[PDB]
């Protein structure tokens, strides 16, 4: 906070006060709706038989139980079907072609229905590699899709090129937040700490969160969104908590001196030579560094 | 700027790198001077003071 | 299941080779067996239309353990002891003899 010219932080946290009408039995729906879940968390088993006869790649994507991975994350076949179409296959193109450029430097199912035939040709409209795409609509325990390539890309790895996309794909990405947690209330003050910093998308949930009490840890977002002194009176609580932890006592007057001096010129100061660059006396910059 | 010389046991500081002993020579003299009229020894506890 | 022994020899005539797995083995060319005389150190040699057989037999660790071989039929159920060297092969070709001046 003092030296590093506070930027993207090791752990962005935000405390959210909750109303008196909402209950802990209701907060779990919001922790499962805001928490970000990568595409890897819905995969159970991956086997691929790389046949050749004209490269061919059939991908079998075993899933978990329908009630298991749907109720656990509140994600259903609708969100999972559109995400794979709009994100997984497109990132499958930008990743395989990326490696191509540097390269030269239980019966499953049958009898697909017409609704998935037009849905199959929809992918072929905006994709050129995949030739077949099947999915389990009634139970959702697997996801098989067939690919066809030419001999110009004969040899290449299969698991390591897909696992990246399994971690890069997104099912729903609330900005700058990956997961929300519900800590036990202290001093009767029920709160909700999320692992991120985002105020714009958070202001649209006043039905269950008070916007007058939401506090944050990042000092740049509270500056860009709330103001200068709004960043002052929240970093004061930051270095107050980091000192109240070890039960040591210190007066708030010095903590206000460091607070105001750190934000004395418009936005922020870093107390380093990059922050001392804006000064009047030259010997300050000469003697320091 | 100077020669990628063979292992020299150190290059020779002309002015600037000589004006920074531990990168900050201003600390050697300008910020702290060798104090005259000073003493240094071990201490001992004493009551009746 | 106890069983007896009938044949025990001292001179070698059979051998087993360790080159690789699943060889075509046209089996139409003559190959040589070279002996010595320590003890039990033998080598081999062979040629073909595009193949040359260069082999040895455990130039470092052979004098401590040995191989024996036998056979059994649906009536005998016994094994006749027969000494057998363990050949290790290195199939080579001829694309050598080039150098820079």
């Amino acid at each position: 906070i003092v030296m590093t010219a506070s930027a993207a932080i090791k752990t962005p946290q935000m405390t959210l006060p909750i109303w008196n009408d909402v209950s802990d039995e209701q907060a779990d729906t919001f922790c499962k709706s805001i928490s970000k879940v990568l595409l890897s968390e819905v995969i159970d088993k991956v086997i691929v038989t790389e046949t050749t006869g004209a490269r061919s790649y059939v991908i079998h994507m075993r899933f978990f139980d329908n009630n298991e991975y749907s109720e656990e994350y509140d994600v259903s076949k609708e969100e999972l079907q559109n995400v794979i179409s709009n994100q997984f296959i497109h990132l499958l193109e930008a990743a395989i072609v990326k490696e191509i450029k540097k390269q030269k430097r239980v019966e499953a199912n049958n009898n697909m229905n017409k609704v998935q035939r037009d849905r199959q040709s929809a992918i072929i409209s905006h994709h050129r590699f995949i030739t077949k795409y099947n999915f389990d609509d009634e139970s959702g325990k697997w996801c098989e899709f067939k690919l066809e390539l030419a001999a110009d890309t004969e040899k290449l790895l299969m698991v390591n090129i897909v696992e990246e996309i399994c971690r890069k794909s997104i099912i729903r990405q609330i900005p700058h937040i990956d997961r929300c947690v519900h800590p036990e209330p202290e001093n009767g003050k029920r709160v909700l700490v999320t692992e991120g910093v985002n105020f714009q998308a958070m202001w649209d949930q006043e039905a269950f969160i008070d916007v007058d009490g939401i506090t944050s840890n990042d000092v740049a977002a509270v500056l860009k969104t709330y103001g200068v002194e709004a960043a002052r009176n929240t970093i004061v609580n930051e270095i107050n908590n980091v000192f109240s932890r070890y039960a040591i006592s210190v007066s708030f007057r010095h903590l206000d001196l460091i607070a105001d001096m750190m934000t004395r010129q418009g936005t922020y100061l870093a107390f380093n030579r990059q922050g001392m660059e804006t000064s009047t006396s030259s010997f300050m910059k000469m003697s320091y560094e | 700027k100077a020669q990628g010389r063979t292992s020299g046991k150190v290059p020779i500081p002309g002015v600037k790198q000589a004006l920074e002993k531990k990168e900050g020579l201003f600390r050697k003299h300008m910020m702290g001077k060798r104090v005259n009229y000073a003493a240094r020894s071990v201490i001992s506890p004493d009551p009746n003071i | 299941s106890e069983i007896e022994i009938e044949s025990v020899q001292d001179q070698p005539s059979v051998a087993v080779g360790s080159f690789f797995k699943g060889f075509r083995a046209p089996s139409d060319t003559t190959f040589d067996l070279y002996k010595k005389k320590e003890k039990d150190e033998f080598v081999l040699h062979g040629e073909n239309e595009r193949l040359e057989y260069e082999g040895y037999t455990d130039s470092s660790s052979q004098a401590s353990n040995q191989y024996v071989v036998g056979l059994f039929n649906p009536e005998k159920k016994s094994i006749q002891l027969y000494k057998a060297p363990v050949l290790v092969s290195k199939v080579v070709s001829k694309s050598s003899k080039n150098l820079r001046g």
Binding site: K155 | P45 | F20, S59, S60, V86, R100
Partner: protein
């Protein structure tokens, strides 16, 4: 009832024993040092110097004189110069040559140095004639009580006649009258592939992953060059060298196929081939061989790979001009890549190196835990004297390159008559500087080594320490130092400073300085011995291969399914894993029993289970040099066993004969006090004081004003301390008597008064009765 004696130890003062010296464990403390420098001369092949100079090679040079297109193609006759025998006899100095003494040499203020001599196997036109010539190269300093100094077979009584201690420890150098001891160092395990995860492999390489496996081979002359193999994200591996200031990322096939007649699937057969179910090895190996058939399809056989190696490495090793690529290629291979197996070792060297590649697949697949660069599982201590021999191996070739550059300096200016004359040989020889004693004295007196070739370790400073003679405790510890390395002082994270419970029994956990050097330099234990000479094996493969182990050429398997047995450097092979569990203690019974002539007792055998992400399975043997040992009481046929570092990790032991239980305990230590060092096992009731108070004491234990030794009238140390009223402690461990500490009194008794009566004492101070000081309380000079 630890009865202390007065008549017996007074009799040892009255007259030293005419027979062998008493308290032999005190002499066994510098056994690492004494045996180190003794090894390079004692034993077969005239020691280590005579075998290393043998493995130096023949260097030739040519003149511009014509022969008499092809006649002009031959540039002329060649001078072949090479050394084959170098020896040091004894330090002599006269006006017949008389004998000099080291204690007399310390008052003489000169360095106690022997006399070096070398013979030159100089030849012409590939040995048409040989001209023998023997000359000296200066005086090399020798330590005390060694194969060269006159204090080797000297009787402990007549040690007093030569003006030194009656129990002289020795093993330290004498340079410019002051004593300096070559500091111990700790390095990587020799002849063992190590899997390690370090992100530094991604900084200097593009698209290179964080995995890595390195092996540290070692020549018979105990030198070493590291063999590192990384893991690339593209699908390949990378081998690199370590030259003067050069590193070359040589691929796997250029360093593997160039060994012997291995151009076949057998490169894949050495890798896991017991089953072909998993394809993570198929895509991996296919990318290696496809990449081999991609950049140069005209390269297929063991000859052209060595012509290409010689072509690329023609100017880096100065192998020129008559040495063709057929000789330079084998030169860079026999001298760099896994040099331990030596010449003619290419029959198993490709099996071990390719198996080292196999474990790289085992590491990146995620079933083998990476080793630690600080744990004592794969860390060996260099004896210091071995570093002296290694320096002599690289510094014996500096004047050889000098005379080579000299005989081709005269060919530039011409006027170089035919070298067939003894006069011309002496003329070109007297111009160069061949004095090496002034350079060995430079390394010792300064501390840092100026290595033209470049050793294997990283730091190029901090190799020797001064002997200030402040007490006997810090001397018996200085001879047992284990310094981690000044390169780690620059490193920030404290993962190495924190202990690791494998230090049990080897290095003391509490004997460690405070402050910045805390956790880095921690001395040895009480009765831990260092093997400084390799046991002549000559039959261990002849008995292991008889116990049921398959041949190294008949196995053609890999993977954790088999138990890979690794003797030092060469691998006998691998067999079914359950045979490793019977042999695990069978070869322990043949080890502890004395009827086996082909198995020494000091043969460490560490067995490893194959389950739960353990280190690569099999069975590891040892017993070379630079190792660490400690005795352990063996219960079956109860006798004294001996084990090493890789033993304590997997198999269990017990510390007291009450913790012994049935069927999962096999070894116990008959003395639970040997865990501590000499200083830590010296303090009474070490199990009652707090650990920060015993580490905070270890410095004071070896920073006393004790009696350094009875040599005052004949020493020449700059600063010296001494006390006179030193008394023996009544409450003392038996080790205080076992090491003859009665000869060196360190402290004295005083009546205690636990009281706040004085007031002046404030929770950290002390009081001394004035009358005691008037009577000589702790008097010193």
């Amino acid at each position: 009832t630890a009865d202390f004696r007065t008549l017996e130890r007074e009799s040892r003062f009255i007259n030293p024993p005419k027979d062998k010296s008493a308290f032999p464990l005190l002499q066994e403390a510098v056994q690492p040092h004494i045996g180190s420098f003794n090894a390079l001369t004692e034993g077969p092949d005239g020691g280590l110097l005579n075998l290393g100079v043998k493995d130096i090679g023949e260097k030739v040079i040519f003149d511009g004189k014509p022969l008499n297109i092809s006649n002009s193609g031959y540039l002329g006759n060649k001078l072949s110069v090479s050394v084959e025998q170098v020896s040091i006899a004894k330090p002599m100095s006269n006006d017949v040559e008389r004998k000099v003494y080291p204690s007399e040499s310390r008052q003489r203020l000169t360095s106690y140095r022997g006399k070096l001599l070398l013979k030159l196997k100089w030849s012409v036109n590939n040995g048409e004639e040989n001209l023998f010539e023997v000359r000296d190269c200066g005086g090399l300093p020798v330590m005390l009580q060694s194969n060269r100094c006159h204090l080797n077979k000297m009787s402990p009584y007549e040690l007093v006649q030569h003006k030194e201690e009656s129990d002289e420890i020795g093993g330290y150098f004498i340079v410019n009258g002051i004593e300096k001891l070559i500091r111990m160092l700790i390095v990587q395990r020799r002849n063992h592939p190590m899997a390690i995860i370090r992100p530094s492999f991604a900084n200097r390489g593009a698209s290179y992953s964080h995995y890595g496996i390195q092996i540290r081979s070692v020549r018979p002359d105990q030198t070493s060059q590291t063999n590192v193999l990384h893991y690339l994200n593209d699908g390949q591996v990378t081998f690199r060298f370590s030259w003067r200031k050069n590193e070359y990322l040589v691929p796997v096939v250029m360093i593997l196929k160039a060994l012997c007649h291995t151009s076949d699937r057998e490169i894949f057969d050495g890798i896991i081939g017991n089953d072909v179910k998993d394809s993570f090895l198929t895509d991996r190996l296919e990318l290696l061989l496809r990449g081999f058939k991609k950049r140069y399809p005209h390269l297929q056989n063991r000859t052209q790979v060595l012509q290409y190696l010689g072509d690329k490495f023609r100017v880096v090793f100065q192998a020129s001009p008559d040495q063709s690529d057929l000789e330079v290629g084998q030169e860079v291979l026999d001298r760099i890549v896994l040099v331990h197996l030596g010449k003619d070792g290419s029959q198993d060297k490709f099996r071990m190196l390719l198996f080292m590649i196999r474990k790289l697949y085992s590491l990146v697949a995620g079933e083998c835990s990476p080793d630690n660069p600080d744990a004592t599982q794969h860390q060996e201590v260099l004896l210091g004297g071995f570093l002296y021999g290694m320096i002599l191996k690289e510094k014996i070739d500096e004047y050889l390159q000098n005379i080579i550059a000299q005989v081709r300096m005269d060919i530039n200016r011409g006027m170089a008559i035919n070298f067939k004359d003894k006069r011309y040989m002496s003329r070109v020889l007297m111009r160069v500087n061949e004095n090496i004693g002034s350079k060995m004295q430079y390394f010792l007196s300064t501390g840092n080594l100026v290595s033209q070739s470049g050793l294997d370790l990283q730091q190029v400073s901090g190799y020797t320490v001064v002997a200030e003679k402040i007490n006997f405790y810090r001397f018996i510890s200085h001879f047992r130092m284990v310094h981690r390395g000044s390169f780690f002082a620059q490193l920030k994270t404290t993962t190495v400073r924190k202990l690791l419970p494998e230090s049990w029994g080897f290095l003391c956990p509490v004997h460690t300085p405070d402050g910045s050097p805390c956790g880095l330099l921690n001395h040895f234990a009480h009765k831990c011995r260092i093997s400084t000479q390799q046991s002549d094996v000559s039959r261990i493969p002849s008995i292991l291969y008889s116990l049921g182990v398959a041949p190294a050429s008949h196995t053609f398997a890999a993977g954790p399914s088999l138990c890979c047995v690794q003797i030092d450097g060469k691998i006998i092979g691998w067999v079914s894993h359950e045979q490793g569990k019977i042999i695990a203690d069978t070869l322990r019974y043949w080890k502890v029993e004395g009827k086996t002539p082909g198995l020494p007792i000091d043969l460490e055998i560490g067995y490893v289970p194959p389950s739960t992400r353990g280190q690569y399975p099999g069975l590891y043997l040892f017993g070379g040099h630079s190792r660490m040992l400690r005795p352990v009481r063996y219960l079956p046929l109860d006798k004294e066993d001996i084990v090493g570092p890789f033993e304590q990790v997997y198999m269990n032991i017990a510390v007291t004969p009450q913790e012994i239980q049935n069927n999962v305990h096999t070894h116990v230590e008959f003395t639970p006090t040997n865990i501590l060092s000499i200083l830590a096992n010296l303090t009474p009731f070490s199990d009652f004081n707090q650990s920060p108070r015993n580490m905070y004491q270890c410095q004071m234990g070896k920073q006393t004003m004790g009696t350094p030794g009875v040599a005052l009238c004949h020493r020449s140390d700059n600063k010296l301390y001494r006390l006179q009223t030193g008394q023996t402690p009544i409450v003392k461990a038996n080790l205080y008597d076992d090491y003859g500490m009665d000869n060196f009194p360190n402290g004295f008794n005083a009546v205690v008064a636990v009281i706040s009566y004085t007031g002046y004492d404030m929770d950290d101070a002390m009081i001394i009765n004035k009358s005691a000081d008037e009577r000589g309380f702790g008097y010193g000079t």
